[PDB]
Amino acid sequence: VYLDRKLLTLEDKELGSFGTVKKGYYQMKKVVKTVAVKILKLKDELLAEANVMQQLDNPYIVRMIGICEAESWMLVMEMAELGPLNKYLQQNRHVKDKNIIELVHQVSMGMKYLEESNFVHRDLAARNVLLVTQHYAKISDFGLSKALRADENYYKAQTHKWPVKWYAPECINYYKFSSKSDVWSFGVLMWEAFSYGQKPYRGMKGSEVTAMLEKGERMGCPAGCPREMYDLMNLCWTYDVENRPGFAAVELRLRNYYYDVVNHHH
Ligand SMILES: CNC(=O)c1nn(C)c2ccc(Nc3nccc(-n4cc(N[C@@H]5CCCNC5)c(C)n4)n3)cc12
Numbered sequence: 001v002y003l004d005r006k007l008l009t010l011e012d013k014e015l016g017s018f019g020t021v022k023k024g025y026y027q028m029k030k031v032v033k034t035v036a037v038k039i040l041k042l043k044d045e046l047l048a049e050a051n052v053m054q055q056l057d058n059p060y061i062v063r064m065i066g067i068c069e070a071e072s073w074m075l076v077m078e079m080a081e082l083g084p085l086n087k088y089l090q091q092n093r094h095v096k097d098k099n100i101i102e103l104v105h106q107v108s109m110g111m112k113y114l115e116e117s118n119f120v121h122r123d124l125a126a127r128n129v130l131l132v133t134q135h136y137a138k139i140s141d142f143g144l145s146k147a148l149r150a151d152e153n154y155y156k157a158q159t160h161k162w163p164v165k166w167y168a169p170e171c172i173n174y175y176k177f178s179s180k181s182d183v184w185s186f187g188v189l190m191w192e193a194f195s196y197g198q199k200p201y202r203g204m205k206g207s208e209v210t211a212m213l214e215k216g217e218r219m220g221c222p223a224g225c226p227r228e229m230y231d232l233m234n235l236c237w238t239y240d241v242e243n244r245p246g247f248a249a250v251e252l253r254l255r256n257y258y259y260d261v262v263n264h265h266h
Pocket residue numbers: 015016017021036038062077078079080081082083084127128129130140141142
């Protein structure tokens with residue numbers, strides 16, 4: 001868990017700005033491993049984040065190498081070279097629809113795993129999906145994640161910043177976060193991905209988003225998004241928590257649609 005700072009080499013220029021994300025190298029038992037390092041500018045939050053990542057083991061979740069306490073506290077992770085999904089899609093506007101389905105399906109597999117593991121992500125957004133390659137996505141950013149109690153299917157937040165545009169109505173109304181509220185966020189993530197990394201609910205305040213949803217209104221179908229994928233976004237945006245599907249049902253819908261698109265392409 002606790003890494004050796006002399007086996008860590010950090011790059012001077014940051015990748016992005018709880019502080020900063022930098023590229024580095026970690027000397028392993030034989031090979032050198034390229035890493036992404038979250039550097040704090042908060043300590044207990046970083047340790048809790050690390051504690052969540054250490055418990056997860058799935059191909060569609062970012063692997064934590066360890067933590068290091070040096071000049072600042074550091075969370076060292078396996079590098080996903082292509083960076084955040086929203087930025088990548090904004091920069092690569094010609095990624096095919098089949099490829100977007102492939103990536104969102106991978107996110108749904110990682111989330112099916114998280115749901116099975118009884119962890120709630122609480123910040124599932126396209127900025128929190130990282131690309132290993134153009135065909136391999138991993139979920140990142142476990143800073144708000146919670147391990148659910150053995151006796152409850154939700155985490156109750158004590159005092160409300162929150163990414164409100166990705167939050168289900170029960171998060172807003174009752175401060176209750178479950179794998180079903182992660183499904184709602186996944187619906188917004190799908191909308192972002194099929195919109196090539198555009199921000200959801202453009203030009204609206206959080207209170208205006210809440211008023212829109214309460215009226216039963218939902219974002220429109222993005223340009224070129226298949227009807228089946230839009231129907232799935234709408235199903236993730238089921239107001240009633242009990243009627244909303246879980247990740248097992250969402251992943252199955254995506255898996256079947258993806259292989260329909262794969263075999264039709266052949
Ligand atoms: C901000 N810019 C970047 O992250 C970024 N820019 N570029 C050009 C990159 C290239 C590769 C990676 N590769 C990586 N591989 C593994 C883990 C990470 N992580 C990133 C975050 N946070 C940022 C910040 C909060 C929102 N989400 C992402 C966490 C927690 N892990 N990044 C990250 C980036």
